[PDB]
Design a protein around this nucleic acid. Structure first.
Ligand SMILES: [Mg+2]
Ligand SMILES: [Zn+2]
Ligand SMILES: [Zn+2]
Ligand SMILES: [Zn+2]
Lengths: 159, 168, 263, 141, 196, 65, 133, 85, 114, 43, 49, 559
RNA sequence: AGAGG
DNA sequence: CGATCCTC
């Protein structure tokens, strides 16, 4: 692998280093092996990073992964965008997927959740628990034909 | 070195060089105290959060850390006099311009950043071409990239197609 | 004579090849444009169909009727119906043509440009007569008729220019070339090996001296001496396409001059 | 007379085919640089021969000029567009009372044709016109 | 379209005089952009034209059959015999000025097709009209004077922009805004509307 | 479907050259290219007008009414 | 005012690097043993070959809109064959006592090395270049 | 209750684009509804163009209620809000 | 369907004046004339001749949109020369050149036999 | 019309691809783009 | 020029589209999954004409 | 999903789109009929009274007119039918549903709406002819092209609604985009190609053309610039007359490769004030680049000034090109006689490398490389030799291309084309792949029945030796057809999948916004980020800049 | 159901 | 238990 390291004269230089690529994952055991740099060990399995190194490390790996898909194509998206998506999957304590059983199962608005998937049943179990909808979500105000607290609606205008 | 940051200091400096008709032949009316303390004072007024307490003052300190690293490096006493060759009048204008542009660069509350982020990722994804891998030329570069990879990520796949472990 | 000069090399009933020396490129082009577009002519601009039992649709026939060349020698002594003070049309602004054909023979009956016949009072003007160029003695083939087939219609021929519709063009392609030796460096020849060998030399190269190899480029030089060939449809004669061309241009320049007086 | 034979994909497995008659089976012992590079013979135990390689194509693709000089999806794109193009669909058009009919006023036979077209009756019921086209940057419209 | 996967709508129509012309007076019926060529790699389009040009001059049917020995060189050799530059290039003059163009144009005949679905068959606009019975929302299709769908995908861009009021206007005033009566007890649409 | 009057490109009256074109091929036994030249169709825009025309009318005239 | 620089140079190299009308001239002054010159010349109007004696001058006058050359009784500061207008863009010093000046004549670049330039060339959008013989 | 004190206000003194657009919109709506103009019109006929000059001369009688996430809010007058943009 | 009538190319509408002389605000002794229902035939011809006059400082024309048959002509002349006079001189000079050409063709035409 | 009369439909192991065995039997080019690509074949 | 091969049903011309199906009485072998207890299957889709 | 998140709406128009080099960036060409259908409810005030009453008497069939008239007590007067349509003397407080007219804010949309830039507010320009007309530089954010595409138009009905379009959604505002912190618009096609050509050192213009070009700029000061050449001809360079389009105070510097402040290759860029010092203007400058002319102009001069710049550059460049001309023929794909000899022998020696490896493999002398099959090694090598061949041959061809080569000219500008295009059209198409590997044995141990069993030679496994210019052999053709089909299936598959991903992304993030305490929160008020993107900065006001303390040697840092 | 981007 | 957008 190609590595940019500082020379004793100050300037950064190319120092080629031996790296091992593995067809398989067992981070737990491999990092405890001698002769390796356990500070540097990496895997594309962000789940495995999260399980071994914690949620904050998982967030780092998750971004690294999302970024890599975009970069490979040639495209560039500003950091903050992926950072937001990555943080959203991370903030729940673990890894909340962008599926119907991921974010849609979360404690959000009954109307804002039925707008995505499993529409009828989302409302059914909402009627069983007798949920009180905040009506602070975009989707609820969209459905209710009201000016949402989005940009222009984020504040009130007084006389 | 090259990182996306607010305020283009290079552009401000060159704007002063033209505006104030700076000549690289006349000695500057600046003093060491003017430059050193001027840049020091400018750093105090680069606002993002206006909280009168310890938590928000340290949060504000943290937010501006990197841009100040840039500010210091660009507006050093040697550089201002040796490179730029700015005057007191020109240097003062540069300082006012940075502060104004920085506050102008801050995100406006109400900004639907959620939809912004989603679309910013979603659109380039639709534009993707070789979803398998462009590394197909070599037999030892077999990693699921493009659209199927993004799909594995977003769905939080219990089993990846190409699970790898890069060891250093 | 005086200013711009003309040298006719080839002249016939259909084409006029000439050298237009002592002129500006702007004038050479303005004359070329006006010849194609702004000289007025007479063409069918209304078709009232009585009966149409042919294989073709009415508008298909009507479209090609407008395309039929008609005598436009005395077109200036005919009004544009738009300026005429009548109701619709008359003998001062239009020519009425009649066409009646029937499948008399078992064999296919053809409808020719000759089969149109003037109804309107011509008032002694060489106008309206369908132009017959074909040796066989018949003009443009309009339609083909079987046996039971019949076609009866009336045509109103009106005054107009090519800008309104391409049918009003005394037109046909106008050949235009200036500086055949590329001495003015007005173009940059695309090549693979040799521009001189790859590009074929013009007919007009005989009429101009070739550049002397290692001679400095003539920067100050301007475009004069134009090689043109004006082809006529038959509506208006060749000489008249060019003369009325000069004349139309002349008139519209004078039009502007007069507008400065109204101001 | 058994000079020709019918072969399906399963029997295709057991046979050895030659593309051209002459060029694929003459003898051996200078070349035009303009002409495309072709393999050689190499295979020798030929049992059958391709009547004409251009027969691998079907109806719509048989209308394309020089598809052997085109990118593979461009040939695919045209095959869908040829079916959108106007022309004389049938001689009895004015006698039929059908929903939607589009007939070109003056249809023209293509200046550049394929040999397949003769059987496809393209020059008899054409779908376009031979337009004098200029590939140029003019008004930018 | 050409017989080469080259889709394209009309941009503008020019009369003969504004069009560029050859030294012969030949003007194009059509003008295509050189940019719609390199990425597309429709080399045949250019060859067809070269062939079709020689064909029109010689008064013959051009062989454009696939697996043949017809070469760009052979066609070019024939076109040059007709007194034109071998690769289809032709000196062209500007219609407005009369001045020669600095560039030489690839000019010649090419079979083009008049495809279905024309502008006028598509041009639709509605500023109020018939409403669907069940939903009390604008109808579907132009052939019914229908309303265009401001889908959820479009809704998202309005949220991104932060145009709260326009997003509300589209979802009410431009579609199905309605007045219902609610009670402060059960909070349901139970309330019997007895106006005046 | 019947010989067009005038060349779309230039406007040279071609609507009177067909009957003569057909005669030059059938009776005179000439080649299309040399036959086109004899009718005075010098430019390739005029040449494609005739050489490329399909006279469908003759097929339509075969239906009774 | 008047002139700002005047010297007679000798052409060492003449390069038409992919241009059919432009050449990049490498010249050294016949008098001064340290004076250099690098300049883009339009050979189509004024051709320059190997070993030519060129009289190079930098004037400043003979603001405002350009009027066509109606030389009825007009007098421009030239008994010269080649005239150019340009802008000063970089005054980079090479060494201890060797200054270099950069001039762009609408893209046609120019570099002049030495030290006799002094407080004359001082940064200006105003710059006239005149060449004769 | 709830509100915020006049002294020590954390929210940006600078007017937001959304604040500006809403203010400009609401004022244009009232100008179109024949409400009085608080600036000398200089051939101005468009309600939005007039409102722009009213914001330029700071003669708009409106207050922005900046709702904070904890349910609370901050009251800011257009007269005090800086319009850099 | 949305296609404008062809007479609108050469025919003036209601209230449509041929020339509209407008004084330029950017330059001294400068005018902008808007020619209505006119194209490159008249534009390029007048502009090229206006340029031939050594009393004219600036002369340029433009057809801002091909949909409409208008054209703007900008003239700047030396102090003591009105642009309307410069345009009048150009027009006459053009007619004068055309008149010469007309008889010149007529003369050579009457020398031919075919 | 000729093309319609010579069409093939494959309902619903990769069937969308132009398999080798299609040589001389099914057209390599003629197939709809998107939705039902390589499932709708032409002889 | 009409080629036929279609039907006239209530005035409308109807073209019957060739339906691609897998041939019967064919003996095909497959390797089955990764967790599966069974590793290889031999299949025959028996049918009568 | 179909009636609440989205629905069909009134005041909507859809039509085929067409390009207009004479329309402003932020303008939209609305056909007369469409303008005559859509209306705006305008209340009668003494400011509009006369205009409204004229349009009211203009009727619903004459363009600058009106449809309905709303009275007090709310009742519409149909101007197409009313017997009082002639009469109607207006009152204040009444609404007049006037036709859509010039400079009205309208929302222009191109589906799929994957962007905020897919929906932008445009200024109206009513035009004849049935198409919706737009500026080519606005093509990219909408991802449109004029090959049959259609676009929707939505009309605001309230004063505050149009204010939201003009102050937030306007086209000039969206120029510099927060997605990639760079401009999402730039100079394309003719204008991109033409700018490179005009901007060359060789390019010189005469007084006659100069004045015409100067006048084309609408903003022009009226001051004729002093020509670069005043020798036996007053001659202007292309650079000079284009600098007229660039406003004052614009400073830009680049440096590419051979760039030395003396730019011998005329590369890089240097712009000081409203004048370009050196370097050819192409995609890197005038495109939608990060440090480009557009990002610079938007940030320095403003959005309205920058939007004007698109028009100015376009008006000049297109005019010059209109009179210069630009084409592309079959002649541009033709590479030299000796070049073809080299190309043919390049592929020949590549075929030998493959044969020798084959011979080595068959002899069991091919070594066992760790992590891969003896046969996997072979295929890896073979594919490498075959790709190396295509590239070497392509380079051999692209090197022979003259600077007058219209295809080379387009790539150079950055308007259209890339190396790969030249290489395939002129030299060699190359190897074809399906499922990542080269053409597989569909038949028993053979790819086609024209080949023999067990043949691993390049020709038998999808290697197309010939260029499109030469023509593909039947085998080559079928093989390119196989690989082509895969690309089309992958297209069809992608569009549907990527679309669903985007929907899920949008749905999961909807309610996340920056609150008044500079914190990123959702609908429950839960903290996502404590400062937006860790700094609380808006992405559009950000750009790449070198932190000078990190780099260099210690000695250089000290110096 | 078939097509257009 | 989901699978881009849009018209016939
Ligand atoms: Mg498209
Ligand atoms: Zn009358
Ligand atoms: Zn109740
Ligand atoms: Zn013709």
């Amino acid at each position: 692998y190609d590595r940019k390291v500082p020379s004793p004269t100050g300037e950064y230089v190319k120092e080629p280093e031996w790296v091992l690529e593995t067809d398989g994952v067992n981070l737990s055991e491999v990092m405890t092996v001698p002769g390796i740099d356990p500070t540097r060990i990496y895997t594309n399995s962000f789940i495995d990073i999260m399980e071994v190194l914690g949620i904050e490390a998982g967030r780092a790996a998750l971004y690294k992964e999302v970024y890599n898909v975009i970069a490979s194509d040639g495209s560039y998206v500003n950091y903050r965008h992926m950072a937001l998506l990555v943080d959203v999957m991370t903030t729940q304590g673990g890894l909340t997927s962008v599926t119907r059983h991921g974010f849609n199962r979360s404690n959000t608005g009954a109307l804002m959740r039925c707008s995505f998937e499993e529409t009828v049943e989302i409302l059914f179990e909402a009627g069983a628990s007798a949920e009180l909808d905040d009506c602070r979500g975009v989707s609820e105000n969209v459905i209710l034909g009201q000016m949402a607290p989005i940009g222009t609606g984020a504040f009130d205008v007084m006389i | 070195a090259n990182w996306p940051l607010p305020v283009n200091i290079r552009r401000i400096i060159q704007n002063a060089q033209q505006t104030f008709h700076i000549d690289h032949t006349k000695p500057s009316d600046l003093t060491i105290k003017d430059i050193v303390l001027g840049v020091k004072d400018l750093q105090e007024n680069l606002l993002v959060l206006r909280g009168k307490n310890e938590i928000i003052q340290n949060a504000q300190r943290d937010a501006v850390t990197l841009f100040c690293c840039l500010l210091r490096s660009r507006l050093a006493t040697r550089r201002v006099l040796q490179e730029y060759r700015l005057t007191k009048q020109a240097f003062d204008w540069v300082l006012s311009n940075i502060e104004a542009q920085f506050l102008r660069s801050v995100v406006h509350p109400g900004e639907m950043v959620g939809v912004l982020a989603a679309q910013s990722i979603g659109e380039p994804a639709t534009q993707m071409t070789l979803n398998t891998f462009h590394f197909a030329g070599v037999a030892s570069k077999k990693v699921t990239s493009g659209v199927p990879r993004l799909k594995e990520i977003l769905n939080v796949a219990k089993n990846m197609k190409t699970p790898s472990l890069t060891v250093y | 004579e005086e200013g711009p000069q003309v040298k006719i090399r080839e002249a016939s009933k259909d084409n006029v090849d000439f050298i237009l020396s002592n002129v500006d490129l702007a004038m050479a082009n303005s004359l070329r444009r006006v010849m194609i577009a702004e000289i007025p002519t007479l063409a069918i601009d209304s078709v009232e169909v009585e009966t149409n039992t042919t294989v073709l649709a009415d508008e298909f026939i009507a479209h090609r009727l407008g395309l039929i060349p008609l005598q436009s020698m005395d077109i200036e002594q005919l009004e544009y119906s738009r300026d005429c003070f009548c109701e619709d049309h008359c003998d001062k602004c239009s020519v009425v043509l009649t066409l009646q054909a029937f499948g008399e023979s078992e064999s296919t009956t053809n409808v020719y440009s000759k089969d149109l016949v003037i109804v309107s009072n011509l008032m002694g003007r060489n106008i309206g007569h369908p132009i017959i160029q074909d040796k066989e003695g018949n003009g443009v083939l309009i339609c083909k008729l079987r046996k039971g087939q019949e076609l009866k219609l009336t045509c109103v021929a009106k005054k107009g220019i090519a800008k309104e519709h391409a049918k009003w063009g005394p037109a046909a392609a106008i050949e235009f070339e200036y500086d055949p030796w590329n001495k003015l460096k007005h173009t940059d020849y695309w090549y693979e090996q040799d521009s001189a060998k790859e590009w074929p030399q013009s007919k007009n190269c005989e009429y101009e001296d070739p550049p002397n190899e290692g001679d400095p480029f003539d920067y100050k030089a301007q475009a004069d001496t134009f090689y043109m060939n004006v082809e006529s449809v038959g509506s208006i004669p060749v000489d008249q396409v060019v003369v009325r061309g000069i004349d139309t241009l002349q008139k519209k320049v004078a039009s502007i001059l007069l507008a400065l007086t109204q101001m | 007379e058994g000079l020709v034979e019918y072969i399906d994909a399963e029997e295709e497995e057991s046979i050895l085919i030659a593309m051209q008659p002459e060029d694929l089976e003459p003898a051996e012992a200078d070349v035009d640089p303009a002409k495309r590079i072709r393999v050689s013979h190499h295979a020798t135990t030929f049992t059958h021969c391709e009547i004409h390689p251009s027969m691998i194509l079907g109806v719509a693709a048989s209308i394309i000029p020089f598809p052997d000089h085109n990118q593979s999806p461009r040939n695919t794109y045209q095959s869908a567009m040829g079916k959108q193009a106007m022309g004389v669909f049938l001689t009895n058009y004015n006698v039929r009372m059908d929903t939607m009919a589009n007939i070109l006023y003056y249809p023209q036979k293509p200046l550049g044709t394929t040999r397949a077209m003769e059987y496809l009756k393209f020059r008899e019921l054409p779908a376009g016109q031979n337009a004098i086209v200029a590939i140029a940057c003019y008004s930018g419209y | 379209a050409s017989r080469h996967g080259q889709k394209g709508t009309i941009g503008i129509t020019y009369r003969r005089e504004d069009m560029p012309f050859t030294a012969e007076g030949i003007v194009p019926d059509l003008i295509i952009n050189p940019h719609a060529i390199p990425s597309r790699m429709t080399v045949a389009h250019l060859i067809e034209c070269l062939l079709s040009k020689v064909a029109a001059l010689s008064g013959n049917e051009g062989d454009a059959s696939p697996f043949t020995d017809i070469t760009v060189e052979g066609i070019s050799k024939l076109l040059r015999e007709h007194g034109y530059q071998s690769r289809g290039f032709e000196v062209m003059y500007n219609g407005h000025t009369g001045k020669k163009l600095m560039a030489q144009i690839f000019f010649g005949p090419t079979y083009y097709q008049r495809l279905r679905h024309m502008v006028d068959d598509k041009i639709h606009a509605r500023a109020r009209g018939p409403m669907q019975v069940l939903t009390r929302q604008p109808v579907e299709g132009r052939s019914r004077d229908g309303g265009l769908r401001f889908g959820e995908m479009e809704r998202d861009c309005m949220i991104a922009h932060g145009a709260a009021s326009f997003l509300k206007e589209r979802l009410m005033e431009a579609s199905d805004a309605f007045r219902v009566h609610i009670c402060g007890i059960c909070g349901l649409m139970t309330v019997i509307a007895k106006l005046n | 479907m019947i010989v067009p009057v005038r060349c779309f490109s230039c406007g040279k009256v071609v609507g009177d050259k067909w009957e003569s074109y057909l005669n030059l091929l059938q009776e005179d036994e000439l080649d299309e290219g040399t036959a086109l030249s004899r009718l005075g169709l010098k430019r390739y825009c005029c040449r494609r007008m005739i050489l490329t025309h399909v006279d469908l009318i003759e097929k339509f005239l075969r239906y009774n009414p | 005012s008047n002139t700002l620089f005047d010297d007679i140079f000798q052409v060492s190299e003449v390069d038409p690097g992919r241009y059919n009308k432009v050449c990049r001239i490498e010249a050294a002054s016949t008098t001064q043993d340290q004076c250099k010159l690098t300049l883009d010349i339009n050979v189509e109007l004024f051709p320059v070959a190997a070993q030519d004696s060129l009289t190079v001058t930098i004037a400043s006058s003979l603001t405002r809109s350009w009027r066509p050359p109606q030389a009825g009784d007009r007098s421009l500061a030239d008994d010269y064959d080649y005239v150019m207008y340009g802008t000063a863009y970089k005054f980079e010093e090479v060494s201890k006592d060797l200054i270099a000046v950069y001039y762009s004549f609408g893209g046609l670049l120019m570099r002049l090395e030495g030290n006799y330039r002094n407080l004359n060339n001082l940064k200006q959008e105003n710059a006239y270049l005149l060449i004769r013989r | 209750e709830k509100a915020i004190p006049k002294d020590q206000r954390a929210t940006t003194p600078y007017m937001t684009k959304y604040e500006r657009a809403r203010i400009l919109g609401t004022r244009a709506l009232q100008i179109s509804m024949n409400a009085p103009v608080f600036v000398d019109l200089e051939g101005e006929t468009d309600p939005l163009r007039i409102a722009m000059k009213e914001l330029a001369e700071k003669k708009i009688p409106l207050v922005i209620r900046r709702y904070l996430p904890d349910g609370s809010f901050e009251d800011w007058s257009v007269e005090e809000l800086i319009v850099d943009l | 369907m949305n296609a404008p009538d062809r007479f609108e190319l050469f025919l003036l509408g209601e209230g449509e004046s041929k020339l509209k002389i407008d004084p330029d605000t950017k330059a001294p002794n400068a005018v902008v004339i808007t020619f209505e229902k006119e194209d490159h035939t008249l534009g390029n011809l007048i502009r090229a001749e206006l340029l031939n006059d050594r009393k004219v400082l600036f002369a340029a024309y433009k057809v801002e949109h091909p949909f409409f048959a208008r054209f703007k002509l900008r003239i700047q002349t030396t102090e003591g020369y009105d642009p309307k006079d410069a345009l009048k001189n150009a027009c006459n000079s053009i007619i004068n050149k055309l008149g010469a050409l007309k008889t010149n063709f007529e003369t050579e035409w009457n020398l031919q036999t075919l | 019309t000729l093309s319609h009369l010579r069409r093939t439909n494959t309902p619903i192991a990769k069937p969308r691809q132009l398999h080798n065995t299609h040589w001389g039997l099914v057209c390599p080019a003629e197939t709809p783009e998107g939705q039902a690509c390589g499932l709708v074949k032409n002889l | 020029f009409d080629m036929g091969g279609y039907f006239i049903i209530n005035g409308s011309e109807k073209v019957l589209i060739a339906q691609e199906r897998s041939a019967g009485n064919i003996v095909q072998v497959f390797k089955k999954a990764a967790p599966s207890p069974i590793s290889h299957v031999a299949e025959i889709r028996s049918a009568l004409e | 999903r179909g009636n609440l998140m989205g629905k069909r709406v009134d005041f909507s128009a859809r039509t085929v789109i067409s390009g207009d080099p004479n329309l402003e960036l932020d303008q939209v060409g609305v056909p007369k009929s469409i303008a005559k259908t859509l209306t705006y409810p305008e209340v009668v005030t003494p400011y509009n009274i006369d205009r409204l009453t004229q349009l009211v008497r203009n009727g619903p069939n004459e363009h600058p007119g009106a449809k309905y008239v709303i009275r007090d007590s709310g009742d519409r007067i149909d101007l197409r039918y009313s017997k009082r349509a002639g009469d109607i003397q207006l009152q204040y407080g009444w609404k007049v549903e006037r036709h859509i007219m010039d400079n009205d804010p309208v929302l222009f949309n191109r589906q799929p709406s994957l962007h905020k830039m897919s929906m932008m507010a445009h200024r109206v320009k009513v035009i004849p002819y049935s198409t919706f007309r737009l500026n080519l530089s606005v093509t990219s954010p909408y991802n449109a092209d004029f090959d049959g595409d259609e676009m929707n138009l939505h009309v605001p009905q309230s004063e505050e609604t149009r204010a939201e379009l003009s102050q937030l959604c306007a086209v000039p505002l969206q120029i510099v985009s927060p997605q990639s912190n760079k401009p999402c618009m730039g100079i394309v096609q003719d204008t991109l190609c033409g700018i490179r050509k005009l901007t060359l050192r060789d390019t010189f213009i005469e007084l006659d053309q100069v004045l015409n070009m100067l006048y084309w700029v609408p903003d022009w000061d009226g001051v004729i610039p002093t020509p670069a050449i005043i020798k036996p001809k007053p001659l202007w360079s292309g650079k000079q007359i284009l600098s007229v389009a660039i406003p004052n105070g614009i400073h830009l510097q680049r440096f590419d490769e051979g760039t030395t402040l003396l730019s011998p290759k005329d590369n890089g860029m240097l712009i000081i004030d409203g004048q370009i010092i050196f370097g050819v203007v192409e995609k890197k400058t005038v495109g939608s680049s990060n440090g480009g002319l557009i990002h610079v102009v938007t940030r320095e001069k403003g959005p309205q000034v920058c939007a004007k710049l698109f028009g100015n550059i376009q008006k000049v460049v297109n005019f010059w090109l209109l009179h210069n001309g630009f084409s592309t023929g079959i002649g541009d794909t033709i590479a030299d006689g000796p070049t073809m000899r080299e190309i043919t022998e390049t592929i020949a020696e590549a075929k030998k490398k493959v044969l020798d490896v084959t011979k080595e493999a068959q002899a069991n002398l091919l070594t066992a490389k760790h992590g891969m099959t003896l046969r996997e090694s072979f295929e890896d090598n073979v594919v490498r030799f075959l790709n190396e061949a295509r590239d070497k041959a392509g380079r051999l061809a692209e090197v022979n291309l003259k600077d007058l080569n219209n295809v080379k000219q387009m790539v150079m500008a950055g308007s259209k084309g890339s190396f790969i295009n030249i290489a395939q059209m002129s030299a060699c198409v190359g190897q074809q792949s399906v499922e990542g590997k080269r053409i597989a044995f569909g038949f028993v141990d053979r790819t086609l029945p024209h080949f023999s069993k067990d043949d691993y030679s390049p020709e038998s496994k999808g290697f197309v030796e010939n260029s499109y210019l030469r023509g593909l052999t039947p085998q080559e053709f079928f093989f390119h057809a196989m690989g082509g089909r895969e690309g089309l299936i992958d297209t069809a598959v992608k569009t549907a999948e990527t679309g669903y991903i985007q929907r899920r992304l949008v749905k999961a993030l909807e309610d996340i916004m920056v609150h008044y305490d500079n914190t990123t929160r959702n609908s429950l008020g839960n903290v996502i980020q404590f400062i937006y993107g860790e700094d609380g900065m808006d992405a559009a006001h950000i750009e790449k800049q070198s932190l000078d303390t990190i780099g260099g040697s210690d000695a250089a840092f000290e110096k």
